[PDB]
Amino acid sequence: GLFGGLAIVADYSFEAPFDEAMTYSVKLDGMGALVDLTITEGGDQMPG
Amino acid sequence: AFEENLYCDYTPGAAKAVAGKDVILAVFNAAGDKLLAVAGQQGLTVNRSKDSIEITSKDTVGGWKSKIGGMKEWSIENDGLYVADAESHKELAKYFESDSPVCVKIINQASKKGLFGGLAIVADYSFEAPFDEAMTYSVKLDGMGALVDLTITEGGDQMPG
Amino acid sequence: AFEENLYCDYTPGAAKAVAGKDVILAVFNAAGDKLLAVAGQQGLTVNRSKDSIEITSKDTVGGWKSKIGGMKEWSIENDGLYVADAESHKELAKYFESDSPVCVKIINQASKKGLFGGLAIVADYSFEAPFDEAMTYSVKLDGMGALVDLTITEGGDQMPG
Amino acid sequence: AFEENLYCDYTPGAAKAVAGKDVILAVFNAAGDKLLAVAGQQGLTVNRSKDSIEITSKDTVGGWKSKIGGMKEWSIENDGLYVADAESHKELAKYFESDSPVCVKIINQASKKGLFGGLAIVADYSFEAPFDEAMTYSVKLDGMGALVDLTITEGGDQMPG
Numbered sequence: 013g014l015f016g017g018l019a020i021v022a023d024y025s026f027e028a029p030f031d032e033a034m035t036y037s038v039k040l041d042g043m044g045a046l047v048d049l050t051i052t053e054g055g056d057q058m059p060g
Numbered sequence: 061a062f063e064e065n066l067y068c069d070y071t072p073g074a075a076k077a078v079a080g081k082d083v084i085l086a087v088f089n090a091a092g093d094k095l096l097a098v099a100g101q102q103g104l105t106v107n108r109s110k111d112s113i114e115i116t117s118k119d120t121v122g123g124w125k126s127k128i129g130g131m132k133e134w135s136i137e138n139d140g141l142y143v144a145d146a147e148s149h150k151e152l153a154k155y156f157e158s159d160s161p162v163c164v165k166i167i168n169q170a171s172k173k174g175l176f177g178g179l180a181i182v183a184d185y186s187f188e189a190p191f192d193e194a195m196t197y198s199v200k201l202d203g204m205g206a207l208v209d210l211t212i213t214e215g216g217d218q219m220p221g
Numbered sequence: 222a223f224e225e226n227l228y229c230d231y232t233p234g235a236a237k238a239v240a241g242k243d244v245i246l247a248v249f250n251a252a253g254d255k256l257l258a259v260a261g262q263q264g265l266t267v268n269r270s271k272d273s274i275e276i277t278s279k280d281t282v283g284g285w286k287s288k289i290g291g292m293k294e295w296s297i298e299n300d301g302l303y304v305a306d307a308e309s310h311k312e313l314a315k316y317f318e319s320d321s322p323v324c325v326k327i328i329n330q331a332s333k334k335g336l337f338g339g340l341a342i343v344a345d346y347s348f349e350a351p352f353d354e355a356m357t358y359s360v361k362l363d364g365m366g367a368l369v370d371l372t373i374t375e376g377g378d379q380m381p382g
Numbered sequence: 383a384f385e386e387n388l389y390c391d392y393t394p395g396a397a398k399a400v401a402g403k404d405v406i407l408a409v410f411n412a413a414g415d416k417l418l419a420v421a422g423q424q425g426l427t428v429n430r431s432k433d434s435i436e437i438t439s440k441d442t443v444g445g446w447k448s449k450i451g452g453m454k455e456w457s458i459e460n461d462g463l464y465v466a467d468a469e470s471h472k473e474l475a476k477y478f479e480s481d482s483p484v485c486v487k488i489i490n491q492a493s494k495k496g497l498f499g500g501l502a503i504v505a506d507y508s509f510e511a512p513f514d515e516a517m518t519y520s521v522k523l524d525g526m527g528a529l530v531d532l533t534i535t536e537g538g539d540q541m542p543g
Binding site for chain 2: 023034
Binding site for chain 3: 396397398399400401402403405423424425426427428429430431432434438442444445446447448449450451490495497531533534
């Protein structure tokens with residue numbers, strides 16, 4: 013793991029041109045602190 | 061499509077891609093009985109943003125700012141080829157002139173599932189006519205309230221016809 | 222074969238060459254139950270390429286830039302004689318008309334071994350009819366994904382029937 | 383063709399080759415009542431191509447990029463001897479001047495079968511006059527839309543005259 017934290021979904025937008033595939037873009041602002049997992053133990057749980 | 065799908069994995073598990081041309085924007089006419097897809101669509105943008113307000117104070121510990129979520133907005137931008145005789149364009153012009161809310165819906169033609177639905181106002185309706193290209197329209201509608209997300213809500217699968 | 226093979230040797234250790242006429246391209250039909258060899262092929266080309274990403278930095282020493290591997294893709298180009306009544310050509314036309322990703326494979330008729338196989342789209346399908354020779358057809362297919370190499374993979378040896 | 387045809391096989395199984403003599407390009411006149419072939423044809427090419435959309439992301443695995451089919455387009459190139467007094471060339475010139483779409487088709491005049499047909503625009507109409515040989519012409523037609531395939535669809539077997 014590299015980073016972790018608690019965020020709010022500030023932006024969640026979509027695009028769909030007629031030449032390409034439908035795309036999404038999400039932007040999350042920080043709630044409080046972001047823990048940098050590269051300089052601490054733990055936080056190595058892979059998705060699944 | 062055989063040899064036990066040794067190389068050509070024909071098994072469908074997920075679309076994992078949606079063509080842009082399959083997602084369209086439609087509006088409800090003045091009576092609302094008919095759904096009309098605006099003619100000559102070539103682009104579509106759906107914006108959904110939420111404001112964040114800072115609640116930092118002297119008792120905040122950790123050296124990181126504190127924020128919380130707030131209000132939400134949504135707006136839709138569409139554009140493409142413009143033909144004045146199209147029924148959908150006439151409906152859009154009537155909505156713009158009469159200053160009335162318009163019911164809009166973003167749907168997926170291929171998957172036969174609706175995506176988003178809302179009530180908006182025609183904020184912008186502009187046209188451009190370059191001499192070496194085709195005349196084009198661009199419309200922008202910002203919603204006057206909630207935008208129901210039909211992906212996580214059952215129903216809302218009606219389509220133009 | 223004898224005189225202790227003093228002048229001519231007959232020991233099979235390898236072939237040292239594979240005649241191009243012995244290797245052809247085959248396509249699975251719409252249901253994929255049959256494998257059809259394309260009619261009247263004359264030339265075949267299989268292209269496989271992998272992108273390279275440059276990672277040179279100020280920490281790099283020795284005076285040589287540093288590169289790493291990246292994404293890889295593949296395509297197949299096949300040309301030959303064209304007959305409109307061939308079953309393989311009819312299936313290719315049906316595939317081209319209606320999207321319909323195609324499961325193709327390169328195999329060796331003489332060695333009875335399959336070489337490559339995978340899914341692809343019919344990107345190009347063109348014809349030429351000069352007045353001094355017979356009609357020629359050309360087809361170009363780009364891979365949707367992995368192209369399984371049957372030379373180093375066990376299995377994949379079904380032949381057209 | 384007897385003694386069990388031990389050396390002379392006359393059984394017709396397939397043409398296996400179509401000479402360029404039998405393949406011609408024909409166009410419909412302004413009224414469309416009479417279809418006529420282009421005078422002095424010498425060479426013909428038909429190009430049909432499909433776009434590929436890359437959909438590679440961080441979710442794909444195996445080291446191969448992912449692509450899907452896209453749009454379609456087609457064109458026809460035809461070169462040969464120019465006879466300015468020919469009715470076919472007069473019709474082509476009228477179409478080029480009046481910028482009206484032209485209906486064209488490809489005919490296998492020997493097998494009495496049609497191959498392709500559709501609407502097109504005359505993008506190029508050029509003539510070269512070397513002092514050694516005859517003065518020639520070249521025409522390029524771009525498709526306005528669908529180029530239907532007569533080899534897999536019934537009908538489309540009308541002939542010039």
